[PDB]
């Protein structure tokens, strides 16, 4: 068939008609972005020649191709650790959430770490790590940051934003009650606080349910 | 079958007609010795960068 | 025969390194975008449309992935919307009374100043409107009373 | 280590900022002798969070930092006939 | 090492060129890298084969050089596009993007020409000599649930003020700096206090 681009929608436009929202959803969506790939290394001599001295006596007339090839792969491997540092090591001081998690009805249990410890990871991070799955001179170099360190960086970014809003990004982490942080964020989108405070339980039930649908979507869809 | 490596005693269960076992990407990673029929596991000799 | 083997294997290794360099640059652009989203979606509230989720970005949560990062974008998605009659400005004593922050909306009979993203009517007052010029200029002038908060006290 | 066998460096329980990256969270430093350790991501900071407590700045700094960005590389030309054949 | 990034580019160029030159002294499986030697001590039917081997090796070296130059040029182009974006949004304006024009709240950036690139001097407002206060989402006066217009309700041990969020400047609660919305039943952390009527 000829594909459909969508459903035609003639907007009810007039020179004196407006549509105003009387409600809201509070939506949580996920974005997945690769940050690094495997740090691989090749011994060009052992790949091309292996253990043969005869081939090793040759391949010297070919020049510095081997020194040029493993220099490029080394630059790639060094860049992968630089990629992870730029993404995750964006935080000074490893922030921790308080033992009393009173965030105005908002429930971050599935994104905060659990001490049951499939590493110091969250419930969502445990779902993520299960969902996605040396010879001839080929070696794989471990990343400088372990998965436990990245999850520690991630939990510090998460603890800072829950407790201190955007202040920790600029300077020192300044504590602010949650749902007072959320009232600031409604002001950023043109909603006049107030709508948050008068709908604080609805805005929370909508947030917690939307977070719950992520763990279902991650567990269900391959 | 000529090669280099370390020959551990293996628990691979070869069929009687077979004489050695290959892996993915076709690398000989097991073999049964002609005398005293028994499967051996080949692992590459230790190597790396320094 | 060794030179033929050397030439083929060397070409195979050059091919591998070239495609790794091209893929590494592709990953680096992804890592730079992920590092920009961490700064602008997690460490702040972004005004850029569709940069941090779909809707009006509120806040994002990073989650660690084996070779990447997962952002949990929390956005304010409006709509249980309704329709209203609208005027650019309101004429009262010939002063044109534009709204300070919201929009003029109308029921079948009455007019209000609601905020543009949430419906919250509020009556027309001098506190939430400002006066500029007379009523001859603006095309969509609509007659209405503008309530002076001070006058009832006096 | 997970990166391999390290000879000539002494492992310590202490954790510091990474100085010479070895890998798998292991870094090296010079104190007398060379030490190997698990790198420290930073100083733990439990922010004093409450449902009715706020922190407000009473002053400021005015910081000036530098960012260096490459914009161009050397414009080179190779006469392939001259290079290959002279 | 402050300008290391710029230095890197220079090195990454020079080394490459060096390799190219040092690939002119490789036999590539021929009798010599000096082509005049091959012509001098060989009959052209065999010198042709030797010249062909040298040609293949040198051509492969030059193709490798050109490919790596194209990849590095794409990297430099991405860097230059980022630098142009920073010139537009940090120097020609004030950016609200976090950490795009330095760490802190961006005030203004200054360009400086660097020998083979650009340097941005980002002046940002870094807050903090901070203090701790008690906050309320709203203030309850006459049962009307007042909210701050532009700042935040903060408390000393005894009194309440409306301060701006990034600098401490108390100011007493008034009808001019608050707006009324609803009654006092809904807001969870609402606190009793008087709001001053000018
Ligand atoms: C705005 O939308 C929410 C749904 O997100 C409405 O809340 C629901 O209301 C129905 C009955 O009115 C209940 O059965 C649901 O349990 C509610 N959902 C939640 C998450 O609380 C809300 O009523 C709407 N408000 C307006 C003014 O339309
Ligand atoms: C936040 O949500 C989690 C799960 O979504 C809640 O954890 C449950 O807590 C109850 C009792 O507190 C236990 O019986 C369950 O076993 C827990 N897990 C699940 C999957 O239900 C947690 O209680 C919520 N937080 C708050 C404050 O309600
Ligand atoms: C080859 O023949 C020799 C000599 O008999 C075998 O060695 C002995 O074989 C008997 C019978 O199988 C065993 O009971 C002994 O234990 C074996 N001795 C040793 C030292 O192994 C040998 O197994 C035969 N190899 C084959 C058939 O592959
Ligand atoms: C538009 O809004 C006005 C003001 O809210 C509505 O007029 C009010 O209607 C209610 C009906 O319950 C009465 O109790 C009030 O006394 C009315 N206020 C007046 C007359 O000043 C009007 O009905 C609305 N129009 C609609 C919904 O079509
Ligand atoms: C908005 O559009 C309507 C629709 O055309 C305009 O209404 C016309 O107004 C002229 C003169 O005012 C009349 O002659 C027409 O008969 C009207 N047409 C209809 C269909 O009503 C109106 O003028 C426009 N501008 C406004 C409302 O400010
Ligand atoms: C406002 O209502 C009046 C009549 O009810 C109209 O405006 C009048 O226009 C005439 C002709 O210019 C003037 O002489 C009157 O002084 C005006 N009266 C006012 C401004 O109150 C007009 O129909 C309405 N204005 C609109 C719809 O924009
Ligand atoms: C918090 O600030 C208020 C106002 O700055 C302080 O209240 C003042 O207390 C002195 C002591 O007698 C009075 O003279 C002032 O008139 C008060 N100011 C008023 C009423 O506006 C209060 O003491 C401070 N609390 C602290 C520092 O804990
Ligand atoms: C903010 O948190 C405090 C501490 O958890 C809450 O104080 C509790 O309030 C309930 C009922 O008001 C009491 O039964 C508890 O004994 C209190 N706990 C403590 C430790 O004092 C408070 O309710 C929360 N909300 C506010 C202040 O609006
Ligand atoms: C404000 O103070 C009063 C008592 O000093 C309390 O609120 C009272 O609550 C009762 C029961 O609902 C009402 O009958 C009174 O009219 C209320 N008085 C008011 C609102 O002034 C309560 O301790 C305080 N309110 C808070 C902390 O929200
Ligand atoms: C109300 O606005 C227009 C008025 O012409 C109407 O046709 C349309 O169906 C309505 N739109 C909404 C959002 O309900
Ligand atoms: C909204 O649109 C409907 C359908 O066109 C119409 O009947 C109604 O009057 C409109 N209301 C307003 C106030 O625009
Ligand atoms: C600390 O170092 C000492 C001596 O190097 C060692 O015996 C001990 O196991 C280490 N760890 C702890 C927890 O003491
Ligand atoms: C004030 O609040 C807490 C209360 O325990 C205190 O520990 C903290 O140091 C103070 N906050 C700041 C950032 O000054
Ligand atoms: C700030 O923290 C200090 C130290 O923990 C505490 O004594 C004080 O009561 C706190 N003040 C406020 C208003 O939160």
From Swiss-Prot, chain C:
Q: Which positions does UniProt annotate with glycan attachment?
A: 83, 107, 143
Q: What does this protein do?
A: Subunit of the fusion protein that is processed upon entry into the host cell. Mediates fusion of the virion and cellular membranes by functioning as a class I viral fusion protein. Contains a viral fusion peptide that is unmasked after S2 cleavage. This cleavage can occur at the cell membrane by host TMPRSS2 or during endocytosis by host CSTL. In either case, this triggers an extensive and irreversible conformational change that leads to fusion of the viral envelope with the cellular cytoplasmic membrane, releasing viral genomic RNA into the host cell cytoplasm.
Q: What superkingdom does the record give?
A: Viruses
Q: Which organism is it from?
A: Severe acute respiratory syndrome coronavirus 2
Provide the protein name. Answer: Spike protein S2'
> Which portion of the complete protein is shown here?
992 to 1145 of 1273
Q: List the disulfide bonds.
A: 41-52, 91-135
């Amino acid at each position: 068939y000829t594909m459909s681009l969508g459903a035609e929608n003639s907007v009810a436009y007039s020179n004196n008609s407006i549509a105003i929202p009387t409600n809201f959803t509070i939506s949580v969506t996920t974005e997945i972005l690769p940050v690094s790939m495997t740090k691989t290394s090749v011994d060009c001599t052992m790949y091309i020649c292996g253990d043969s001295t005869e081939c090793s006596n040759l391949l010297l007339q070919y020049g510095s191709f081997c020194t040029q090839l493993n220099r490029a792969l080394t630059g790639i491997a060094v860049e992968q650790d630089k990629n992870t540092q730029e993404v995750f090591a964006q935080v000074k001081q490893i922030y921790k959430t308080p033992p009393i998690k009173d965030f105005g009805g908002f429930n971050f249990s599935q994104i905060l770490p659990d001490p049951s410890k499939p590493s110091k990871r969250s419930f969502i991070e445990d779902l993520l790590f299960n969902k996605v799955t040396k010879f001839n001179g080929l070696t794989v170099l471990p990343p400088l940051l372990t998965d436990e360190m990245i999850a520690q960086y991630t939990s510090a970014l998460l603890a800072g934003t829950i407790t201190s809003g955007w202040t920790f990004g600029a300077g020192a982490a300044l504590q602010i009650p949650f749902a007072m942080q959320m009232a600031y964020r409604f002001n950023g989108i043109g909603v006049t606080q107030n709508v948050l405070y008068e709908n604080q339980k609805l805005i929370a039930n909508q947030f917690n349910s939307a977070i719950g649908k992520i763990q279902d979507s991650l567990s269900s869809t391959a | 079958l000529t090669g280099t490596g370390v020959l551990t005693e293996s628990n691979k269960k070869f069929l009687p007609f077979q004489q050695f076992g290959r892996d993915i990407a076709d690398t000989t990673d097991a073999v049964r010795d002609p005398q005293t029929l028994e499967i051996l596991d080949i692992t590459p000799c230790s190597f790396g960068g320094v | 025969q060794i030179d033929r083997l050397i030439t083929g294997r060397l070409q195979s290794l050059q091919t591998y390194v070239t495609q790794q360099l091209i893929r590494a640059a592709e990953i680096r652009a992804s890592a730079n975008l992920a590092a920009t989203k961490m700064s602008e979606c997690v460490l702040g509230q972004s005004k850029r449309v569709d940069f941090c989720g779909k809707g009006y970005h509120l806040m994002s949560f990073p989650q660690s992935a084996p070779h990447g990062v997962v952002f949990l974008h929390v956005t304010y998605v409006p709509a249980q919307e309704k329709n209203f009659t609208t005027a650019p400005a309101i004429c009262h004593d010939g002063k044109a009374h534009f709204p300070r922050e919201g929009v003029f909306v109308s029921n079948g009979t009455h007019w209000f100043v609601t905020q543009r993203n949430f419906y919250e009517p509020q009556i027309i007052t001098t506190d939430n409107t400002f006066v500029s010029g007379n009523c001859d200029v603006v095309i969509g002038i609509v007659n209405n009373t503008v309530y002076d908060p001070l006058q009832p006290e006096l | 280590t997970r990166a391999g066998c390290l000879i000539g460096a002494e492992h310590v329980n202490n954790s510091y900022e990474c100085d010479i990256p070895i890998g798998a969270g292991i870094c090296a430093s010079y104190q007398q002798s060379i030490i190997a350790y698990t790198m420290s991501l930073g100083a733990e900071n439990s922010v004093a969070y409450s449902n009715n407590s706020i922190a407000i700045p009473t002053n400021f700094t005015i910081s000036v930092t530098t960012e260096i960005l490459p914009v161009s590389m050397t414009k080179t030309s190779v006469d392939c006939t001259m290079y290959i054949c002279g | 090492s402050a300008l290391g990034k710029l230095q890197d580019v220079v090195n990454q160029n020079a080394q490459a060129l060096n390799t190219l030159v040092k690939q002119l002294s490789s036999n590539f499986g021929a009798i010599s890298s000096v082509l005049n030697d091959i012509l001098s001590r060989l009959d052209p039917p065999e010198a042709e084969v030797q010249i062909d081997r040298l040609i293949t090796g040198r051509l492969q070296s030059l193709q490798t050089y050109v490919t790596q130059q194209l990849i590095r040029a794409a990297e430099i182009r991405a860097s230059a596009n980022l630098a142009a974006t920073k010139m537009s949004e940090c120097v020609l304006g004030q950016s609200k993007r976090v950490d795009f024009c330095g760490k802190g709240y961006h005030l203004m950036s200054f360009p400086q020409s660097a020998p083979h690139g650009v340097v941005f001097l980002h002046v940002t407002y870094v807050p903090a000599q901070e203090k701790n206060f008690t906050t309320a989402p709203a203030i309850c006066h006459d049962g009307k649930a007042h909210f701050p217009r532009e700042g935040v309700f903060v408390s000393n041990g005894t009194h309440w003020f409306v301060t701006q969020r990034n600098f401490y400047e108390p100011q007493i609660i008034t009808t001019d700096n608050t707006f009324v919305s609803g009654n006092c039943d809904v807001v969870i952390g609402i606190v009793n206090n008087t709001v001053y009527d000018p």
